[PDB]
Amino acid sequence: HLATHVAKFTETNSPGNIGAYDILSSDMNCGYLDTANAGWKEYRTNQFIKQVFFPVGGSYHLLSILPSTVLNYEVSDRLYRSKIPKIRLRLLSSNAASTTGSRLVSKNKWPLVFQALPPKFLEKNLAKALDKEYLLPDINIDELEGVDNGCLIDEALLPLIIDEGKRKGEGNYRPRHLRDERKEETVQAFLDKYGYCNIPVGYEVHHIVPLSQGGADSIKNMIMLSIEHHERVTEAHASYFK
């Protein structure tokens, strides 16, 4: 009807006449506000209302939560002329408000509501979804050519490795904190990539976009290298990733 604490607002299918009203007016400047601290221009058992548990320092108390529909009506008219950001909520029809039976909700069934956005450089987008996805090589499946067991053995294929380092991850650099981590699974990755007992003394570990423009610790995004090849590609990648 017109009471401040009316049920059937946060949910439905709750047969009850739950109205708590407000005969208390303590409008001091505390560190908080309630429905009595507001402008305020306008109770037995519970079922299908939200019930929560709160520790009292000792035991727990089970609390039923009732809405603040008079504040919901007042925020709309306060925010009608205000210049702070606000979010509309058109998630209602007239028949639901007629069945609910609230005259205050019926006048404002599509309310202009308060909002709390984090600042606009935190909202995700296509770049903030593509930065968490890292590329993969398009050829590494098995021992194809120039390779005995994982390691690049034969020569005349390091141009192919250098154009696989190219042709992917150009111009899409991310900040240092926007980089994939180096996990501790990698020792088991060298264990069960092909059957090695541990990390070889005569071999190292490398990727194709190391810590720059993609690259992750997948099951396939590493290529172990030799000393001369790794020494050459440390400057070859920095030739274009200056």
Partner: protein, 302 residues
């Protein structure tokens, strides 16, 4: 005991996440992968539409499933006798069947790749791949599985159904499933992502699911095709197609409830805990099927 508790709540045991779309070919599937943005069109209106590029052939859908035990996921019960009674019934069902006849059909649903609804029709070839975080599995072709004839004698279906039936029984505490699919339509054709329920005062067009630009499907819709195994409803021999599992059987396709009679959920719980009669195995299959999905099972106070 005479009645259901005043506040009964069940957590869902199959929590799926929302999926996201990507476009790729069929010879470069695992290799490379492009974002599928939602473009816009003119209609005689401001209509949001999505389509593949001219240099792509298939589309890719990835989504994840999380499994929790039915015994442990009792969020709120206001009784002890009812809790012990349904605990004993759950242990009896584990002892007599092992939650396998439900899990076989729960993985039969993803075997035929029913979660691509309007994406299935007109597709050429399907490559639904199911991967658990510790064990990879062989793929399968979704065109070889009928949408009504279930398979209860497969190998990968049996293995995944048993490994999830252990979690359903209570041997484990969680399970995580990652699913990827590669439906092949054609060159520069149209895909069908999900559509939101965003009402508007002025707009009258259709807005599809953006999800950081790259299109996708709601988890509500992508779960609906993984629990459509109810073939134990009455007069099933006159219909010859499965339906999703609910309380009253009120599928939104028909409008007439499939099982609103005593073969239901309320009238079987009233005949299982209180009556304790030997209701047949299909009724118990349905009862633990709806108890897997969960919800609010409070008694109808007024």
């Amino acid at each position: 005991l005479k009645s259901r508790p005043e506040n009964l709540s069940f957590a869902r045991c199959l929590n799926t996440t929302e999926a996201k779309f990507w476009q790729t070919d069929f010879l470069k599937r695992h290799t490379f992968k492009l974002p599928l943005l939602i473009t816009d069109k003119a209609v005689l209106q401001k209509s949001q539409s999505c389509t593949l590029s001219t240099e792509c052939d298939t589309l890719r859908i990835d989504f994840g499933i999380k499994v929790l035990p039915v015994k442990e996921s009792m969020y709120s019960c206001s009784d002890y006798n009812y809790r012990t009674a349904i605990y004993q019934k759950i242990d009896e069902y584990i002892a007599e069947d092992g939650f396998l006849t439900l899990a076989k059909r729960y993985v039969n649903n993803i075997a035929n790749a029913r979660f691509l609804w309007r994406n299935r029709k007109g597709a050429e070839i399907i490559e639904t791949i199911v991967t658990i975080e510790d064990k990879e599995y062989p793929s399968f072709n979704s065109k070889s599985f009928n949408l009504d004839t279930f398979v209860e004698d497969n190998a990968t279906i049996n293995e995944i159904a048993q490994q999830i039936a252990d979690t359903f029984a209570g041997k484990r505490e969680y399970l995580n499933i990652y699913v990827t699919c590669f439906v092949k339509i054609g060159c520069a054709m149209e895909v069908y992502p999900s559509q939101e329920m965003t009402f508007d005062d002025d707009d009258k067009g259709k807005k599809l699911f953006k999800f950081e630009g790259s299109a996708g499907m709601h988890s509500q819709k992508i779960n609906n095709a993984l629990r459509t195994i109810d073939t134990w409803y009455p007069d099933y021999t006159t219909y010859e197609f499965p339906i999703p599992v609910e309380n009253y059987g009120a599928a939104r396709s028909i409008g007439i409830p499939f099982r609103p009679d005593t073969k239901s959920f309320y009238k079987l719980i009233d005949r299982m805990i209180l009556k304790n009669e030997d209701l047949p195995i299909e009724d118990k299959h349905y009862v633990m099927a709806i108890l897997i999905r969960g919800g609010m099972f409070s008694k109808k106070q007024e």
